[PDB]
A paper describes a structure:
The final components (~15%) are closed forms with a long wavelength spectral feature due to substitution of a single chromophore. This chromophore is present on only one β subunit where asymmetry is dictated by the corresponding α subunit. The structure of the closed form HaPE645 provides an explanation for its unusual spectral properties. Our electron density maps clearly demonstrate that the chromophore attached to Cys82 on the β subunit in the αSβ protomer is unambiguously PCB (which causes the secondary absorption peak for this protein at 645 nm), while the chromophore attached to Cys82 on the β subunit in the αLβ protomer is unambiguously PEB. The N-terminal region of the α subunit appears to dictate the chemical nature of the chromophore attached to Cys82 on the associated β subunit. In each αβ protomer, the N-terminal tail of the respective α subunit interacts with pyrrole ring D of the β82 chromophore. For the αSβ protomer, the side chain of Leu6 packs against the face of pyrrole ring D of PCB β82. This pocket is specific for PCB and incompatible with a PEB chromophore due to the steric clash that would be created by Leu6. The excitation-emission map for HaPE645 suggests that this protein acts as an energy adaptor with excitation transfer from higher energy (562 nm) to lower energy (650 nm) chromophores within the protein. The spectral properties of HaPE645, a much smaller constituent fraction of the cryptophyte PBP antenna (~1/7 of the PBPs), fulfil the requirements for a terminal acceptor of the soluble PBP antenna that acts as the adaptor to bridge the energy gap and transfer the excitations to the integral membrane photosystems embedded in the thylakoid membrane which have a local absorption maximum at 668 ± 3 nm (e green spectrum).
Numbering used by the authors:
A (entry chain A): 3 to 80
B (entry chain B): 3 to 176
C (entry chain D): 16 to 176
D (entry chain C): 6 to 68
Amino acid sequence: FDGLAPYVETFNNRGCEFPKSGYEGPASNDDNDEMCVKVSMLRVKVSQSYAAKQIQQFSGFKESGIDVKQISNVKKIY
Amino acid sequence: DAFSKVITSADGKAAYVGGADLQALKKFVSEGNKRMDSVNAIVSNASCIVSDSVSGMVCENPSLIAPNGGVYTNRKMAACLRDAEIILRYVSYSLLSGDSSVLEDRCLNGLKETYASLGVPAAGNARTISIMKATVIGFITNNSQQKKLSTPAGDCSALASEVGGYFDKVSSAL
Amino acid sequence: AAYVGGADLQALKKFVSEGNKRMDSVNAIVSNASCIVSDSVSGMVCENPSLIAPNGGVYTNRKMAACLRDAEIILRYVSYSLLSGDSSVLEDRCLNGLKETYASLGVPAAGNARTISIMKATVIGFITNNSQQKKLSTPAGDCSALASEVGGYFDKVSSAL
Amino acid sequence: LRAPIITVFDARGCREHKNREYKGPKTGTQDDEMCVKVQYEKIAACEDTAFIVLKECLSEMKS
Ligand SMILES: *CCC1=C(C)C(=O)N/C1=C\c1[nH]c(/C=C2\N=C(C[C@H]3NC(=O)C([C@H](*)C)=C3C)C(C)=C2CCC(=O)O)c(CCC(=O)O)c1C
Ligand SMILES: *CCC1=C(C)C(=O)N/C1=C\c1[nH]c(/C=C2\N=C(C[C@H]3NC(=O)C([C@H](*)C)=C3C)C(C)=C2CCC(=O)O)c(CCC(=O)O)c1C
Ligand SMILES: *[C@@H](C)C1=C(C)C(=O)N/C1=C\c1[nH]c(Cc2[nH]c(C[C@H]3NC(=O)C(C=C)=C3C)c(C)c2CCC(=O)O)c(CCC(=O)O)c1C
Ligand SMILES: *[C@@H](C)C1=C(C)C(=O)N/C1=C\c1[nH]c(Cc2[nH]c(C[C@H]3NC(=O)C(C=C)=C3C)c(C)c2CCC(=O)O)c(CCC(=O)O)c1C
Ligand SMILES: *[C@@H](C)[C@H]1/C(=C/C2=NC(=C\c3[nH]c(C[C@H]4NC(=O)C(C=C)=C4C)c(C)c3CCC(=O)O)/C(CCC(=O)O)=C2C)NC(=O)[C@@H]1C
Ligand SMILES: *[C@@H](C)[C@H]1/C(=C/C2=NC(=C\c3[nH]c(C[C@H]4NC(=O)C(C=C)=C4C)c(C)c3CCC(=O)O)/C(CCC(=O)O)=C2C)NC(=O)[C@@H]1C
Ligand SMILES: *[C@H](C)[C@H]1/C(=C/C2=NC(=C\c3[nH]c(C[C@H]4NC(=O)C(C=C)=C4C)c(C)c3CCC(=O)O)/C(CCC(=O)O)=C2C)NC(=O)[C@@H]1C
Ligand SMILES: *[C@H](C)[C@H]1/C(=C/c2[nH]c(/C=C3N=C(/C=C4\NC(=O)C(CC)=C4C)C(C)=C\3CCC(=O)O)c(CCC(=O)O)c2C)NC(=O)[C@@H]1C
Ligand SMILES: [Cl-]
């Protein structure tokens, strides 16, 4: 186990006046010429500082996001 | 092939599929355009998917951030958030490629034994995965509060079933 | 750290309006902070992608990290304004001079304005949330006064910046 | 770069954590099982958060 995972990027960029870099193959002569998928393997990292923020954010044990099932408990279940 | 070369390079080199190669890719996988939108719904929501899945694991069992709990320290929480993202990203690649081979061989192979040796709670992983699965399916099927990705309105239930299967492979393995 | 529980909390909820709902509104903000922050900043970017083009306001990891931090700082001072029922601390400790700091750093005012307007709509949405009770973390009811109040606090931010 | 970090503990029914942080008078009501914590700390700039948000952005740019 090396911590590496595939980062997939979906660029649907019709109408974008930004130089195109990355793709080096033939043109389609349609909208696909303004769209690209990118894949790379990269080590996924999470900082201790973000982890600490998350611990604090989760420590109410009560508030979810909007319009989702509620599964919170006040007792230790496992 | 193009993606397996970068997956085995394991060194940050990128593969790019645009233009005619992308038009072709979308002919060789089922529901090519909808499949790219489904992938987009994972990768553009990656941070909130991970956070909500771990947060729900924790609100269901607050003892996970009590002293000695599975994610009590910043170090352990960081590892857990990391793993959730790793798994989510392998699922995203499974959806891009229409195949779970890389997820199984590079992510899930040995993972259960690893968690058993570290004491990582199987019930916590089970809940995190179930929420990640539901969240991804929600974004793909417009069941989410936010609909920030503009798509043509249609039925993506087949892709939602497929990605659900990939999460179910994770759950099975763990 | 200050701890306000038991009789101090009961008293606090008699000295601020809407005391229980007020605690709930603060809980909803802080318990969703990372998404509120990322959705706001990334919405600024997705609407104006030049912000992540070369030399754009948040185009490097370091710049983006600083902007996400500042957005969190602002959200937290707004959360404290809602907890206390007063914007004095927000005005004196976070907004006083911030526009000049951002001018000196070249942080784009229009970008800031959009992060704030998304953040305002998002926080108000957590307070006016009308989800069915089984999908709602609090007792369903009217939190209009707190939504108005927090909108005012965001308006102070927008005005200052 | 400090800000008030607020945690809201609606701990009604929670027995595993002992309610020892608040040391003022109690009430004999459920307010004794709820507490707000406020602390003023440096807010970190997290480059991992920046990286993942940038990746999100790159896959959703409008034009
Ligand atoms: C990524 C954040 C997000 C945005 C933005 C959006 O629009 N939707 C988002 C997330 C999202 N979450 C779910 C589903 C669930 N989330 C949880 C966790 C929370 N419930 C709690 O009780 C709790 C602690 C207090 C949480 C944190 C849960 C349990 C679910 C339901 C999972 C299930 O078993 O079905 C969704 C999917 C919503 C849907 O079903 O359509 C989404 C999109
Ligand atoms: C992230 C926290 C969250 C949870 C959980 C949930 O259920 N809702 C949440 C956030 C939320 N966001 C808004 C409003 C906006 N968010 C954006 C940014 C995204 N839109 C994009 O186009 C984009 C790039 C592709 C994004 C990132 C924007 C622009 C808005 C609208 C702001 C406005 O001017 O009105 C809300 C508010 C309620 C709503 O549904 O709009 C909420 C709760
Ligand atoms: C119940 C939700 C629960 C289970 C089950 C479990 O395993 N752990 C649980 C709760 C939990 N609580 C904290 C931290 C914490 N709770 C409070 C509120 C409490 N303290 C008081 O003095 C009063 C009086 C009214 C109340 C109510 C506070 C203030 C804190 C923060 C402590 C601190 O460090 O400042 C935690 C986090 C770990 C821990 O036990 O400290 C858990 C998991
Ligand atoms: C329009 C969305 C836009 C404006 C306006 C702006 O100011 N910047 C904009 C876009 C933008 N694009 C990137 C990076 C990027 N785009 C693509 C897709 C592109 N490349 C191709 O080869 C093709 C089509 C065949 C398209 C379409 C890719 C692959 C990338 C990443 C390149 C890489 O590094 O791997 C960026 C990021 C900033 C930058 O300097 O790259 C912006 C802001
Ligand atoms: C469930 C997945 C969604 C839903 C998706 C649909 N997308 C449809 C067409 C479509 N999507 C794209 C963008 C996509 N293709 C790419 O190459 C990339 C990035 C590299 C992306 C992100 C395109 C270009 C198209 C074709 C139409 C167009 O020109 O925009 C679609 C129409 C049916 C189809 O084409 O198969 C659907 C239903 N729709 C939903 O309601 C849920 C939320
Ligand atoms: C808008 C803010 C919300 C909404 C909130 C409501 N909360 C209501 C009652 C209520 N909330 C609490 C918990 C709160 N009090 C505290 O002291 C703390 C922690 C320190 C918290 C988190 C309590 C104790 C109560 C009273 C009822 C009870 O005993 O549980 C409420 C009912 C009306 C009212 O009490 O005025 C509402 C409407 N409801 C919504 O739909 C939005 C999203
Ligand atoms: C999060 C929902 C879990 C949780 C996760 C933890 N995992 C911990 C260590 C760990 N994870 C892996 C697998 C990971 N590395 C990879 O390269 C890949 C795939 C390519 C994956 C999926 C490994 C090998 C390790 C050990 C090495 C390391 O720490 O990086 C971990 C630390 C455990 C401890 O030190 O006690 C945690 C906390 N923990 C939970 O409670 C929830 C359920
Ligand atoms: C994010 C929405 C916007 C953005 C932000 C951005 N900020 C900085 C750097 C700084 N921000 C501050 C902010 C504060 N000082 C205070 O006293 C307070 C109140 C508590 C705040 C909020 C400061 C001091 C700095 C400088 C120190 C530092 O870098 O941390 C940057 C970095 C600028 C740089 O290149 O170094 C950025 C990018 N930028 C945007 O474009 C968004 C609109
Ligand atoms: Cl070009």
